[model samples]
Target chain A: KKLILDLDTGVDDTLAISYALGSPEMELIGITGTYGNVLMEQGVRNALAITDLLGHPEVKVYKGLSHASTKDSFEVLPISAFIHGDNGIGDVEIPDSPRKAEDESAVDFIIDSVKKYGKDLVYVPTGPMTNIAAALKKAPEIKDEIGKIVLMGGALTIHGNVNAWTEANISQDPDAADILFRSGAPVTMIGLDVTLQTLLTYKETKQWRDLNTKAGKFLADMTDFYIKAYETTAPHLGGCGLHDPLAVAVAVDPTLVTTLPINMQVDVEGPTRGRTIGDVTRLNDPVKTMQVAVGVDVPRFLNEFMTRISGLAKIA
Target chain B: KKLILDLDTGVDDTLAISYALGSPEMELIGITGTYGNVLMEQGVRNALAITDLLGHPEVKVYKGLSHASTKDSFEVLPISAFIHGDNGIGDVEIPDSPRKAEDESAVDFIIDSVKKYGKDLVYVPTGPMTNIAAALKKAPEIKDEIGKIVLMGGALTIHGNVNAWTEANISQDPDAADILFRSGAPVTMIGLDVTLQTLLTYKETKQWRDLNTKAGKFLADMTDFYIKAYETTAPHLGGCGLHDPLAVAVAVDPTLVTTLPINMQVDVEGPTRGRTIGDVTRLNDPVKTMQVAVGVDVPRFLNEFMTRISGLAKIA
Candidate 1:
């Protein structure tokens, strides 16, 4: 019943947190942040602000690993301003929280939670897997205890826009990605392959804003900027990358997505570290340790997302 | 500088009828034998015989290609009981012939000799290209009319060795070994890498003892029955290969062997091709050719062979 939201507080992360807060199905236990679009200090501050905006100030904001575990990659996608508008979603701001951190360590928090909850808890990590992998290492025994690991990473079914054969989250810290993958947990990698297919750009943003809701207006403008940035490099791919919110949506309602079991792996080194490659013909390993989700029912996902965001928009 | 020779005759072909002839400094020609040592009737008529022992033939025997142009390998070594007895050593068994072979090729014959004589003619191959490959292919232009190619026969070396790469000579017709090896010169290549290095064995059982002499001592026990049943499997080595005295050695010394330069190529197709591969490795438009003793080498070579055979038993 309780779901922990970890994020960097970007537009997608904001929408994801908003949706989880509105869903009576999941209890907001805690919010955590890792650096990606912004500095770690800024990311942590933004996470707290999003929690307060939802009137859930009781939800503690925590900071996580500052550096990504990946040793190699050409460039890392930075999406801080696209959603936050140089401030953060909903103009919802917080100076800083006095709550140092309820959990001394994110890895410990994860391990303890799984051990306490046993086999019923599902984990959703939308950012780099640094803390998650740390937890698995701290308690490798709990890897089996994990009900499901839904990560918003990898680009198996499609190309990587960041680096050849790379995705953002995995590319950010491949050391953790490697551990998470090899840990043998049932994983649902929501990567750019499908995300890029259902991209939201300026046109899509305009339609959302027609609702005249706070969250819609904010998303419309944020999507416009994100799409603009995305198109700069790939005009042929003119929509915003479905970044991270989709991972949370899929976990909230499994019926909202379509998936298949395909063999996949994430690169652990070289210029292409973090890229999730799908070995369709299996040029490498014939046996696979991960379950790759290739397809998603985009309409169902968007509808559920929009419905939740609408509710938060009026309240905010 | 020394020149080499290549002759394909049966064991008695070693008793070359013209050996009692040829220049004194003619030096031993490089030699080797192929399929003709046993089967493939070609070299059968050209080998040496025990009836005329006491002659130390100065030539080494070489292995010929097994199956012409085919991947199937099946060429036997000397097992001739007629001349070499059950063991291929002249039946007289004077502690086994003292002389062995240089293991070089008739090809080297033309090369090293040409290098020594420069513009002086040196007897080239009278046998297979197995030796010609070493000689003619080394360098194509330099050795002037020093001598012509007094070889056996054939029209071309192209696609020879059976169909493509199975010549009885030249590594059993590694066609690539000879396609680019013929030097435009006075040359000759006996088609049969065989040609009788054979000698008579059963003659001693009959009344051929009328010419008894030191040479007649070679006939004391001509047949392999003294040491075997048929020709001993050890020496016949494919019927009686290496009988080129008539092939080329005769050219350098007609009395010793005798030869004629006739333009020809080793047959290179069907069941009996590539016995001898020849290609114009020389820049010259074409090479002139010839051939000499095949079945007989005369008394001159016989006398030298007898002395040489006697010499092997002496230590040092």
Candidate 2:
């Protein structure tokens, strides 16, 4: 399947990029940067650098909206920075890539990709939904033509990280997320409901370090920082969740999780703002447009992750 | 199944009593009254009169809690009175029964019945959970021993009636409902999520009136008033929901609905008070203790309901 990674270049997002590059089933098309863990410019830079370090500088990065469509500007939440680090890649510095982002905007690239690949393309957005929402608005024709949108956001059956009822990516731009949800697009929400079940401890990071390659060490160092942050924030989990990477893996193999089909909506106002719930207006509709991940095959996914990502590190 | 209906004897609760008496599969051991649609005493009186009117004078009535466990006293909500009428049966008078309630308290009857009948007893609560919560507290040993508690309340994947986040039955005594949800008992929640899908229109009531019997006329008159209330409150639905009767039907036939196994909890405080959601504390538990109905076989259920209730009405 042809794939695009819409990212904020957070620590887990960097892992998602590597996982995508490693999987033979997924054709890494391009990276689109959006703002959440860092500014769009910084995220694009990180995406370029990480791809170059992983020996895939040929993959171009594209810049999405610099902030939420509803807001004048964007500011990285302190908690987001604390989780992903100040630089959005665990504060680990890498040499700048000679390659530059594509001249075309992220929204345009998305529209063009759908027109080209059609049903064979899988668009995975692992950040705020501003870019996807904008693309749908700018090119209404692509709404029905696009293959699928697999996103990593929202919490339907679990408590969210940003607040009691809101997930980080959706909370960052709830109106945008709401637009994407109600756009009649095919969406599979890989939210906290299943993502938090896929945990990674130092044991996995130790294997990446033991590879003794630059690519391996970089991933190890970056993800170790992520695990450390989880220790303070979610100690009960005993490890960091593979949030972004899990979404990428599901894009390639959907059988990794069991999903519930329903029409969904994001609460864009009031005390429960940003809550991803069943759309009451569409509750009785015979046809549902969205699938929510409610259960996951953890051991199967973890084994596949270890095999594929370790193979990429070995060659790099 | 030997069943005990814990009811507020609302208009729908009157239909539920008739449905239970009509179904040969259900042996209604007693009716335990709780305060929600009316005062506990009035509800008990309604239950006794309804049972006698339906030619089941053998069924005894038991008085449960008169108010919420956390409150000093309870008053009938104007909305509840509007929907069920001041007498709780659309003010269509039925001759009061000479028989009185049993000497045993509702909570004691539940505990004693569970001890005597063990797994054969199915307890269905069609009102606020004050009585069930009290019974559980008074006899914690019965929590695991009771067969099942199928209640008509809560709204998991749909908008609620009392507020955006709360169903009427749960809103009445959220703290008590929370206790019942958290208790380690086998529970099936036939909440608003599925009940609203099982609608009662004038079409079904017209058949009852055509029978030209006392029981037939009584049900048709009672339900017509319920439908009138829905026209003013929920004009879009075009009919009233078979809320309490659906719970009774599910108690007789569990396959009428598709349920999701989950660990659920009722929010007792904050803006989302009375909201029933997946319990975050038990999200990762390997075994779930509750089943929430998410889908209903509407045609199949409607057919069975009409066949049984109409048959009973013709004889009466």
Candidate 3:
């Protein structure tokens, strides 16, 4: 299946890039960069560098919106820096890619790709919905033509990372997310409900380090930074979540997670802003446009992730 | 064990009262009334009448606060009237008890009872926490000295009845419930998470009607009204929830449901007000002050309820 990664290119996003590259069933077609873990420009640069290091420079990277639709400017949150490191790859320096990002903007690429690839394309956005929302607004026909949108954001059945009722990605641009959710598009939300259950400990990172490859070492170093952050911020979890990678994994194998079919909407006002919940007005609607992932096969997914990513690391 | 029922005397509350009266293990000590389904005075009168009908008029009734501690007055919500009937007991009139309520207020009675009965007494509040909060404030020492408080309110892992995030009992007096939750007292919350699972269909009510006794017929008539309301309000449920009775049942046999031990608090302000959630500040506390019911033994509890209540009805 052809796949596009709409990313903010942080530590977990880097992992997601490799996971998509490693999966034989998935064709890593393009990368669209948005802002969350780092600046949009920095995120695109990280995507280029990481893809080059993983021997997948053929995969094109595109620049997305630098800020939320409702905001004039974007700033990296202190917590985001703490989690993903200042450079969005754990301060571990990697060789810059000789290849430059594609000239076409992310929204244009998304709209054009869906027009060409149609149902074969799976769009996985692991950042705020800024780029996706923009593309949808510019090309409204993709609402019915696109294959699937498996994004990583929101907290339906659990407390969120950003606050009691908000997740970071959805919190960044609540209106954008709300627009996407209620657009009647086919969406599968791989939110904190299931993502937090798929943890990545040092044991997994240690295996990558032992591979004695640049790709292996880079992933280990970057993810180690993430694990360390979790140790301070969420010590009870004992490890960092495999957030972005799991979204990519689910894009490849939908069986990896169980989902609840319902029409969803993002709370775009007051204290619950960014909260993704069931659209109560459409509760009894026969057609549920969105699927919210509530359960995951953690061990199966972890094993698959380790097997595929390790294989890619050894060759790299 | 000695038990006190703090109720709003709705349809479900009447079922809870009868369940307690039928259970041989529980000693029906007294009843405290507060405003919710009906006015405080009406609720107390209903309690007196119910006890008299059940041939347990020896069980005393006491008057609680007329409204929420933070509110000036109370009015029955239209939905509440529709669910429990304007009279708060399915509009089924029973012969009034000749006995009058105790002279002492509900708060005074609660504090005095906790002082005397200590851990042997179980405080079951199947209504707003106004009365309980008042008792705790008047006698702060009872916070530690009192027995378990098993209440029916909140929606920890489920949508609430009143709104998306707010439960009826908690919404009536959120600040009061918050005070009780953070008071360092042992609490077991029988919230919508489990109560909604213990449904009472017309099949069970029909059995009561078949008993050919006044007590059985009265219960059948009242619960039928509840089921009819649920048909329109929650058609997917196919019946009414055994909300208040589940709390009383849990008080008798806690093994009927699985509990998650965590410190909880009510969201007192803004859009998410009246939401019962884990107190994040106390997430790492060694002593978990509250038990939130997350799972229930549906078949076992339903069987226990029918067996005991049917036996009492047959005798009556």
Candidate 4:
């Protein structure tokens, strides 16, 4: 069974979608949208846009939550100039008029899917936990209705570019993270602690574009612009972060992860709250459920990740 | 300059005493006893017996506080047949004793000796930090008069055998660790972290003893008995923990130690209190004078340590 991918598709998230679609390893059950790179409606459109780029229309899409910021606010730079060179999907743009929504709201779809599929389905939320939390709130009876939630949020070693202690995914809806943890679904949190460790630099990126595959050239152009957004913020740090996709890879191969089983609870109060501090000791409280993974082998992931992502034929 | 010894000789403490007496780098200044090991009286006798074996009559052994700040700080492990042995000297039966008392109390002797020497004198405390704390309390002005404090207490990544979350020294007079932290002197904490990592197994024990030196012979014999005791505690996973003498070597030759400067503050409140949590990030804290080391190069140390000890007495 493939994962239920919930994300806020910006440029890199678009790449993550392309990679998942390109691989036969994952049968994309559904894709849910949330507000991060753009508004909720725009995020829905972005999901469809990515599918249009991948030429996979059978992959169902659902619209998710619209408004929830980490701090008081969030800023979204129109990455049109950056990612698709002013047309939002390159000069060879296909209108979302070709596709229609799958009718179910992302949260309701997730709750019904989990309840119907029994308890082994995985939820990979690359964006904020807003939709996942909404599903948890709507159907608290199906709390453990899912096998595992592989998520990208709440860094231990790397602080956020958005907030000092709060990463963008969890920070956007700290309340949502609180709800998700309380939901009692088995969780493997792959925060920036793992993501920052796996990065694709410019030299290798250009090589992908130089592969001359139709999809490769398109993504290479997209990656070139996407890299600038993060690189400008951190000049010396030029490598593009392996963010949401890492959560997907972790879902497929669990051994590639090193984890410490912790009784994790998200703090929603103090300045440095919303962080994942757990009953990290087994003796006192061996509530052996929550596993916090902190590291990954970058090279192994890049080989698998790039192989799948390059197979997309959105350009042709 | 020699190390002014202060200990209440437990078996491990006695082994540290043996290591120091066997090493040429150490000059025997004086020896003192605290209420630890087995009350102050037996502690004094053990100190005298050790010096007696070395034929050093000038090394004065003094008694310390008969009671801990608490009524029952530790379990009463009387060292009658265990450490000092049936004769209180490991049945060696030395002829002449060390000199009569130079000062009334160990605390007074430490303060007076430091004042007389004025500078470059190292304090090697194997037992609790009480006597040293009291001595420093008496001559509070001699903060800079003493060079380095090489004491055994605290752990970086392991628990202590004395109790959960405590080494013997801190568990003895935890308040004393606080005063010592505030002492404005150079401090190097050598504790279970490195000792557990650097311990030599029974196999290594055979190799250390094969050198044919009396010091090697002494250490090997002690290891034979001590290994049995450790098996009860950690079974087949024990080695001779070279903690105290290494602390002394670190004092004599800073090269022997690799230290990271941290502002250390002693926890004084709860069940897990009395721990010395070093502030690794703060550069401006006034208490940042201490060097709290967590690692050591064991191979280099064992070579230098074994070579230095081999030169101390007749090989044979």
List candidate 2 segments past 4 Å from native: none
Task: Report the number of backbone clashes for model 2.
Answer: 0
The lDDT values for all models are: 0.50, 0.90, 0.89, 0.66
What TM-score should be assigned to candidate 3?
Answer: 0.73
- Write the residue-wise lDDT of candidate 1 on A1-316 in tens digits: 5666667566677667777776767666676677555555666777776566555678766666777764432222434454345654434434455555655656667777778776666677777788787778778887677667777877653345455446666767777887887676777788765565455556656766777865556556655666665666557655765657777777777665556443455555434456564332332233555655545677777677667766666565
**The candidate that achieves the highest DockQ relative to the unseen native structure:** 2
lDDT of each residue in B283-313, candidate 3, tens digit only? 5455889988867898898998999888888
lDDT tens digits, residues A1-316, model 4? Answer: 6578887776666766876786776678888888765556766776776676567777788988776634454555454244433433333344564676678798898988888776557788888888888888888876666777888887643344455445777777888887776566788888765676667877767776776765566677667666775576555556677787788888888877777554566657644455554421221243646676754777898887877776565344
TM-score per candidate, chains pooled: 0.46, 0.98, 0.73, 0.53
Interface RMSD of each: 26.9, 1.6, 4.8, 10.1
Instruction: Give fnat of each prediction, in order.
Output: 0.00, 0.38, 0.13, 0.00
How good is the docking of model 1, by CAPRI class? Answer: incorrect
The regions of model 3 sitting more than 4 angstroms off are A1-6, A15-35, A38-42, A54-95, A100-125, A129-152, A156-164, A172-273, A277-316, B141-144, B235-238, B284-287
Can you write out model 3's per-residue Cα lDDT over A144-238, one digit (the tens) per residue? 99999999998876577887788999999999999999999999999887787787899999999999999999999889989998899989889
Q: How would you encode candidate 2's per-residue C-alpha lDDT over A13-125 as one tens digit per residue? A: 98899889999997999999999998789899899999999988889899899989799999888988898998899878789888899999999999999999999889999
Winner by lDDT: 2
User: Which 10 consecutive positions of candidate 3 chain B have the poorest summed lDDT?
Assistant: B277-286
Query: What clash pairs does model 3 have?
Result: none
True-contact fraction for model 4? 0.00
Instruction: Quote model 1's TM-score.
Output: 0.46
lDDT (10s digit) by residue, model 4, range B1-316? 6677677665556656656666666576777787554666766776776555544556677767766654554444553245334433344433434455545887887887788776667787877788877777777876788766788777533345565446766777878887887676777887765565455567755765677765456555655665664556555455556666676666666676666555565656644456555432332343457776555777887776656555443443
Poorest lDDT segment (10 consecutive residues) of candidate 4 chain A: A277-286
